[PDB]
């Protein structure tokens, strides 16, 4: 009836980033969403406290967004961008160029964030080959960094739950140290920033001639536990990259489009990427579209007569999908007409105090926040900062507790993520912090 | 204004698989489509003779497909498949399992064909270490194989012009030869087949204890020039993969969903893949949805208590998108109520005769076809079968002539690809083949 839908799900599906024995024990099937809440096939409603995995902006069944896709259906759903283009993709490219960092003048589409990162890495590799510098073939990427699941993006990721096993498949990369101030040693953001930059510079001084690009998440590392970079760090990596002739790839797939209370997160420190990835909330969270921005200097390294062999030979079949681009176009009009970014910045002030209060809980160790990008790191001892053994599944148990309490999210290890939709109201925010607090306590007061 | 949308496209876009200097010289912006024709912003109409790069099934503005997406907007556009599922992804999963090879019982969603292949390759690699055979970690891919553009897909793909700037970023891979009947000495499909299988068997015999999987396009190598595998070749590959304990990965991204006159091309030789990649036409050409099918034996090697770390740690954020899944569900209902596959198979009989007439031209060296998947290889000499030098751009020029004559396709080197929508009538196919024949004559008669 809907009983059968549940059994079908367990019989035919294989779900991303999930142990299916876990799914089969606690299955959940979503049927509709309205505002910032989704509804399962039984009629239970849940706050979407993780924005459907960090991509949902205006909430669900956002009226203008729905209208924008109906309008485009009435014209054409998809025609190709291989050797040509279409209207919404071209319009969107100009709108994207207008709001991104000033040095990024080019828009290369694809389907997902891993793909946009996969394209940034290939662009950066082929640039140096193109301009007669074929030795520049290694990458630097940051520890605790994550850039997607395909093999290039994996070669540049460093979350060892996900990646360690795939080492034989990975290309040659250096891993640079980032600040993780919470379980640091001095606990000072300036000291941690300066030490990690010092070590970046020494790595660069020794090997830059072999290195095409450096990859880094913009301001906040997400899959690693919503670890926010100390002030001045990102701008410090930009300078080091410029100085040692390494292209800087900035990953904005999670932080992009208002998430950190700027349109793009590298605005906090005014950094200009050479290459920049984006996805998730670009479409409001409706459809798979992704982008790699490039500078003009990069673009023209590939512009030449065709048998001069400059061409970038990459491109997915759905590249520039009109349906995706149309809803992205409306999304960005909503940012403008709603003043979304400003409202996120305002609402994050009070949210700040709401989140700092969780510290009152015995097993909450750290609270991290930049805008609407937050994590509560759970700890078996605040004093110690010693974490619970992984085998007690504390983050997992907390997610399940929140779920029965009517709120959806996913933990990053024992870090409880909180990335509520950008349209979230001040009262919705406090209603979600309250459920999260209740859940952490109920689970954690028993150290399950 | 037409002229400034055109100048915006030259200014802010970087297109897929395109030398932007070629684009600038000959810009083309599509506005709408109706049935199997698309229309540019100047109002000029074109036959869609490459199905918008091999993905459009029913034409454009297909009413049923249109209704299906509108109906889904009215419920929800995207909620996550991480740790949970939704209604259309669940229903779609069931239907896909029913129409796919019987041994394939499991569906793992993604956004694109490359991502589906990347998933297949990561499943094969981790499968063997989950069951305690870490030795089995190498891949075999077929000479002239194309599996997508992301780094893992290109590590198992061999299109010299595409891959191998990127040599340094692969991942070593065993390359086996495919029978290329047209420019082979005997040729003779049976002689070719059996010798390429003798070389595979040799490769397996020596290295099979190191090999995780063999990766192969299903029945036709597309990007390499629409090269049809001889009868018995695919069934022999499968047999040798079984004999030597190597998983068979089958790429159906281009051939899948009716293209070759079967629902899946592997049905031609009755082959059961271990892992099967699909995409493109899965949605009728409307949206980016892809699938990796897996057997239950493979699924169950990642199925275990979370602490025994069996889990597949992979999954894009738009996995199981309701919008793509909804349109795909309706796409498949059409295959059923419109008997698309049987209609393609039937129409393909007369079509073969249209294409044999094409063969009458002095510079048409070969015609290749399986269902609606066709290729007309151009040669400067049809008795020596010598190719035009690349530097005289014969494929590119033919595609531009077809353009002005009102038809879109893309060449593969000097092979003119012909992949018309599956809804194409008998009349429309002959209209299309005639425009293609005129354009080959007008370009090629001037080139000696
Ligand atoms: C989401 C994420 C990705 C991967 O994007 P997908 O669409 O899931 O493939 C890449 N980089 C960052 C920083 C991300 O947050
Ligand atoms: C189209 C294709 C791919 C890649 O799919 P995308 O959606 O373009 O990334 C991979 N393998 C084959 C055989 C294909 O035809
Ligand atoms: C567009 C998609 N990446 C695809 O697989 C098509 C095959 C390669 C396309 C090369 C061309 O048509 O110019
Ligand atoms: C969904 C997408 N692959 C993404 O970037 C999130 C990765 C980290 C999420 C880990 C989890 O939620 O379990």
UniProtKB/Swiss-Prot annotation, chains A, B:
Belongs to the class-III pyridoxal-phosphate-dependent aminotransferase family. BioA subfamily. Keywords: Aminotransferase, Biotin biosynthesis, Cytoplasm, Pyridoxal phosphate, S-adenosyl-L-methionine, Transferase. Catalyzes the transfer of the alpha-amino group from L-lysine to 7-keto-8-aminopelargonic acid (KAPA) to form 7,8-diaminopelargonic acid (DAPA). B.subtilis is the only bacterium known to utilize L-lysine as an amino donor in the biosynthesis of DAPA. Optimum pH is 8.6. Homodimer. Its main location: cytoplasm. It is found in: Cytoplasm. GO terms for molecular function: adenosylmethionine-8-amino-7-oxononanoate transaminase activity; pyridoxal phosphate binding. Its cofactor is pyridoxal 5'-phosphate. Inhibited by 7-keto-8-aminopelargonic acid at concentrations above 80 uM. SUPFAM superfamilies: PLP-dependent transferases. It catalyses: (8S)-8-amino-7-oxononanoate + L-lysine = (7R,8S)-7,8-diammoniononanoate + (S)-2-amino-6-oxohexanoate. One of its GO terms (cellular component) is cytoplasm. HAMAP family: BioA. It comes from Bacillus subtilis (strain 168). This is L-Lysine--8-amino-7-oxononanoate transaminase.
């Amino acid at each position: 009836m809907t009983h059968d839908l549940i059994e079908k799900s367990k019989k035919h599906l294989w779900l991303p980033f999930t142990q299916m024995k876990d799914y089969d024990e606690n299955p959940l099937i979503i049927e509709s969403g309205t505002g910032i809440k989704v509804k399962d096939i039984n009629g239970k409603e849940y706050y979407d406290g993780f924005s459907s995995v960090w991509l949902n902006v205006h909430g669900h069944r956002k009226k203008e967004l729905d209208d924008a896709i109906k309008k485009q259906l009435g014209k054409i759903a998809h025609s190709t961008l291989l050797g040509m283009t279409n209207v919404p993709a071209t319009q969107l490219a100009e709108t994207l160029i207008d709001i991104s960092p000033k040095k990024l003048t080019r828009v290369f589409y694809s389907d997902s964030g891993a793909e946009a990162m996969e394209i940034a890495l290939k662009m950066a590799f082929q640039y140096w080959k193109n301009i007669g510098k074929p030795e520049k073939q290694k990458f630097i990427a940051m520890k605790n960094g994550y850039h997607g699941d395909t093999i290039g993006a994996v070669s540049v990721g460093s979350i060892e739950l996900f990646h360690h096993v795939y080492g034989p498949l990975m290309f040659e990369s250096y891993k640079a140290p980032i600040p993780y101030v919470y379980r640091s040693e001095s606990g000072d953001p300036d000291e941690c920033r300066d030490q990690c930059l010092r070590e970046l510079a020494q790595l660069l001084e020794e090997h830059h001639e072999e290195i095409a690009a450096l990859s880094i998440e913009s301001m906040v590392q997400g899959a690693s536990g919503m670890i926010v970079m100390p002030e001045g760090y990102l701008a410090g990596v930009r300078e080091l990259c410029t100085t040692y002739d390494v292209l800087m790839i900035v990953d904005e797939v999670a932080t992009g489009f208002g998430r950190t209370g700027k349109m793009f997160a590298c605005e906090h420190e005014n950094v200009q990427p050479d290459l920049m990835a984006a996805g998730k909330g670009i479409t409001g969270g409706y459809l798979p579209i992704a982008v790699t921005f490039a500078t003009e200097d990069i673009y023209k390294a590939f512009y030449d007569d065709y048998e001069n062999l400059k061409t970038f030979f990459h491109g997915h079949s759905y590249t520039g999908n009109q349906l995706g681009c149309a809803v992205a176009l409306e999304n960005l009009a909503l940012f403008e007409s709603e003043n979304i970014v400003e409202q996120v910045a305002e609402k994050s002030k009070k949210l700040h105090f709401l989140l700092q209060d969780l510290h009152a809980l015995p097993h909450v160790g750290d609270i991290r926040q930049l805008g609407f990008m937050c994590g509560a790191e759970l700890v078996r001892s605040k004093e110690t900062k010693e974490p619970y053994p992984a085998d007690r599944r504390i983050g997992y148990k907390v997610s399940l507790k929140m779920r029965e309490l009517g709120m959806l999210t996913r933990p990053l290890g024992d870090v409880i993520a909180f990335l509520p939709p950008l349209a979230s109201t001040a009262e919705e925010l406090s209603e979600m912090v309250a459920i999260m607090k209740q859940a952490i306590h109920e689970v954690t007061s028993l150290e399950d």
